[PDB]
Amino acid sequence: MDVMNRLILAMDLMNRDDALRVTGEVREYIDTVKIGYPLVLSEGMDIIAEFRKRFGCRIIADFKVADIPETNEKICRATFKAGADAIIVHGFPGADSVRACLNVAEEMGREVFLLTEMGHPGAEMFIQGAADEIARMGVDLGVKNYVGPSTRPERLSRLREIIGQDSFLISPGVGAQGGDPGETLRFADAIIVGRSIYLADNPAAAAAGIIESIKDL
Amino acid sequence: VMDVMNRLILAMDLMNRDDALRVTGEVREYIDTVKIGYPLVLSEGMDIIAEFRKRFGCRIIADFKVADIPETNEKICRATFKAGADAIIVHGFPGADSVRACLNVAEEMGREVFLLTEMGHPGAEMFIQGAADEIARMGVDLGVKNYVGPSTRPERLSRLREIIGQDSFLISPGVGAQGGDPGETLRFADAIIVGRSIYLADNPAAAAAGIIESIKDL
Ligand SMILES: O=c1cnn([C@@H]2O[C@H](COP(=O)(O)O)[C@@H](O)[C@H]2O)c(=O)[nH]1
Numbered sequence A: 001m002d003v004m005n006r007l008i009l010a011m012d013l014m015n016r017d018d019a020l021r022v023t024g025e026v027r028e029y030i031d032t033v034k035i036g037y038p039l040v041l042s043e044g045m046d047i048i049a050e051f052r053k054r055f056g057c058r059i060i061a062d063f064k065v066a067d068i069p070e071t072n073e074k075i076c077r078a079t080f081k082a083g084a085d086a087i088i089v090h091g092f093p094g095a096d097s098v099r100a101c102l103n104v105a106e107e108m109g110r111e112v113f114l115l116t117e118m119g120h121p122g123a124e125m126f127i128q129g130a131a132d133e134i135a136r137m138g139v140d141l142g143v144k145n146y147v148g149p150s151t152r153p154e155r156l157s158r159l160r161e162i163i164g165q166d167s168f169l170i171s172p173g174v175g176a177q178g179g180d181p182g183e184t185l186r187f188a189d190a191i192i193v194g195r196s197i198y199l200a201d202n203p204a205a206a207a208a209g210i211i212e213s214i215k216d217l
Numbered sequence B: 001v002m003d004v005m006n007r008l009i010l011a012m013d014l015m016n017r018d019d020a021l022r023v024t025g026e027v028r029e030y031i032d033t034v035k036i037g038y039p040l041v042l043s044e045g046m047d048i049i050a051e052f053r054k055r056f057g058c059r060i061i062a063d064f065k066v067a068d069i070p071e072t073n074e075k076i077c078r079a080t081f082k083a084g085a086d087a088i089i090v091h092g093f094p095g096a097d098s099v100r101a102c103l104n105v106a107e108e109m110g111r112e113v114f115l116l117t118e119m120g121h122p123g124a125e126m127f128i129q130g131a132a133d134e135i136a137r138m139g140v141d142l143g144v145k146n147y148v149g150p151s152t153r154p155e156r157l158s159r160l161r162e163i164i165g166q167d168s169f170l171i172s173p174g175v176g177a178q179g180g181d182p183g184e185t186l187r188f189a190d191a192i193i194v195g196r197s198i199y200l201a202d203n204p205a206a207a208a209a210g211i212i213e214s215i216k217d218l
């Protein structure tokens, strides 16, 4: 996957007008947008097609898929039907639940991104201790796309070690949550940035600044 | 705790508005509580909740298995309650702060959180099962009063009931298609969740009636 400027916009605004306007302001800096439930549940799944029509950008649905296999397949089908190019799935629920997603992605020409470890404080309670095993499960299942935490560069580095240099890795937690753009890119192929951009007084300048700090990479 | 008619909750996972509405209407005389998940919501929009409320006199539980960071969890809960959902199901594996974020929104918006402590599919054995008891204990500590546990694992469901106490409310999916027995599950759960066994039946009403007939004494 070729992500422009190695920067993925996490568009979590919950108003269609603001979401479209802000994304439009930073469109020259990106070509990949991560859309999640905050926006989809507020404005509908048709918003995905609207983004493709207005920006011709890649769409990653950050839906943290975490249900039983049967339901996961239905969720992936509905998501890809709406035009998403990829979907983010939790690994904690087990291999069968991940496989269900991989099946639908293969049938509709999309990609599955396996979320192995999250970066918020609570992730240390249960997720962190299972993260390495979840990553190995991904490798065993043939997963090639992963999501790891910018807030814990040592954990992100370990994830990269497990999956190898060939796998694709994206990482949220940059900016608002404290992650550093440059350091995160030492291990991840692309960084995900939300609030530091869409809540900034001037989103375009915010995006430009981040890219400027990593222009060397 | 919510008074679930016949201790039976319909898992409406059909992905077509016409079929979802028709089947729910066919069993309305037996159920006043419907669980709506992403299969239907992502196919027809959150306004589907409005349609169900308008057409039927049923409570709505949004099975969204919320599993994001605290900030995103808050946004998801706000959007879900804004649409009319009475309650939302949240995953506990992401930790205490992520669950607390949901409880805070539920409290401010006057709605409820159901904590999913353990799942019943085969894959649940890998990581979820070993963390379930602690996730349940965490829920009790956080003040959670509503829980979701697996009908497919009677031993696990029984332990969950012990951990949360008799006052807590517990609902359980996995009955029917996944092999769980209605009566056996109700020994521990306040209500059972049933999807395919009802919505894929030639006559959903007859299927619902049959299940209720098997637990009449309960
Ligand atoms: O471990 C994870 C997984 N996902 N996200 C998601 O990535 C984005 C981060 O946005 P932010 O830059 O505004 O913090 C949000 O959409 C959030 O749900 C995280 O923050 N951390």
Ligand SMILES: O=c1cnn([C@@H]2O[C@H](COP(=O)(O)O)[C@@H](O)[C@H]2O)c(=O)[nH]1
Pocket: A067, A068, A071, B011, B013, B037, B063, B118, B119, B120, B121, B149, B150, B173, B174, B175, B176, B177, B178, B193, B194, B195, B196, B197
């Ligand atoms: O541990 C869990 C948690 N949730 N569900 C959900 O409960 C319903 C079960 O439906 P079924 O009767 O068709 O199996 C579906 O909506 C499914 O996502 C399970 O099956 N198991």
